[PDB]
Amino acid sequence: PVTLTLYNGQHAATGIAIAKAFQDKTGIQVKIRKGGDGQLASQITEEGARSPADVLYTEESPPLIRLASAGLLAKLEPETLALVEPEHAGGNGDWIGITARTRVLAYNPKKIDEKDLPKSLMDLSDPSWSGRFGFVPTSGAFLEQVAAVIKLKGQEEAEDWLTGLKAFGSIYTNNVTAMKAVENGEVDMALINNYYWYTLKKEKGELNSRLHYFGNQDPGALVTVSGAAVLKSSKHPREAQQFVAFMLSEEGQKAILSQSAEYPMRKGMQADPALKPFAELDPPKLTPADLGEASEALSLERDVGL
Ligand SMILES: [Fe+3]
């Protein structure tokens, strides 16, 4: 008769799938509140000790870092933390990575050959790309991408870069519409996360668009971590801890990956071989903790007006 409340920043189908698999294993019912990572983080911030949320599940790590710094998250059970590499968990062990996603340049090969794509993410502020690419300034992983450009290239070059994106990029409300616009022939390329192509490929059967990976430790090769945590205010701590642990069990990871084409954070578990091999991503040397709350990046987004 215990009911957990899950605040789900991950994509709706993904949260529904993991919560269902946890219900089928344990008998515990999971009520879901779906929202944006930051929206939910702010909701928990204001509800504070009165929040009904038992577990929070996000697409990206800054909201977990933010909440962990506020003291709102519970220390996770050591057996749960032992399931991932330590750089994929909070430094104080009160949130844990569940899957990783990575930044891509989706493109339409009918409208641009692969050899003619930008060689670096930093190239997209050049005027020659004007009208040719989409990006998503409200996106949680885009915000991490900005943070990464600041850390790797410094504030002055990040500001110039993002000024160029505002001048020359095309704004999409979310990654789904950016991906569709590349597929539909409406924009030559777009910066999104890797898994969106696999969702559209499942729905339509075959696709015109293709994914380009910057690699080479480029700022654009960033890997970001979707994570989860138990709320310190939870009146069901044991059951909430079991839920997070189940998310990193083999069955839980598979249930998540059946809805999202992401990389498992469970040690020793491989992603679907249809993904670009994680080892070939060659991302910039940036951890979730390096990206932090992405506060400076958010400031830059607001200053530049995106
Ligand atoms: Fe997403």
* Residue 11 annotated in ligand binding: yes
Cα(230) to centroid of ligand 1, in Å?
22
Is 176 exposed, middle or buried (CB count within 10 Å of its CB: 0-12, 13-18, 19+)? middle
Helix (H, G, I), strand (E, B) or coil at 84: coil
Which residues in 201-218 are b (16+ Cβ under 10 Å) and which e? Answer: eeeeeebebebbbbeeeb
> What is the CATH topology of the domain spanning 102-223+276-306?
D-Maltodextrin-Binding Protein; domain 2 (3.40.190)
The phi and psi torsions of 14 (rounded to 5 degrees) equal -70, -50
Cα of 290 to ligand 1 centre, how many Å? 21
Cβ(95)–Cβ(180) below 8 Å = no
174 CA from centroid of ligand 1 (Å): 8
DSSP state of 154: -
Do residues 194 and 257 make contact, with C-beta atoms less than 8 angstroms apart?
no
Resolution of the experimental structure, in angstroms:
2.0
User: How distant, in Å, are the alpha carbons of 122, 240, 285 from that of 152?
Assistant: 11, 37, 9
The angle at the Cα of 195, spanning 252 to 164, to the nearest 5 degrees, equals 140
* DSSP annotation string for 175-194: HHHHHHHHHTTSSSEEEEET
For the chain, the structural domain boundaries read 1-101+224-275, 102-223+276-306
Q: Look-up: residue for tokens 């729905």?
A: 203
195 is in an annotated binding site: yes
Q: Cα–Cα distance between 47 and 44 in angstroms, integer?
A: 5
User: 114 C-alpha vs ligand 1 centroid, how far in Å?
Assistant: 25
- Quick one: CATH architecture of 1-101+224-275? 3-Layer(aba) Sandwich (3.40)
Provide the b/e sequence for 161-171 (b: ≥16 CB within 10 Å): bbbbbbebbbe
Distance, CA of 288 to CA of 5 (rounded, Å): 26
Question: What is the chain's length?
Answer: 306
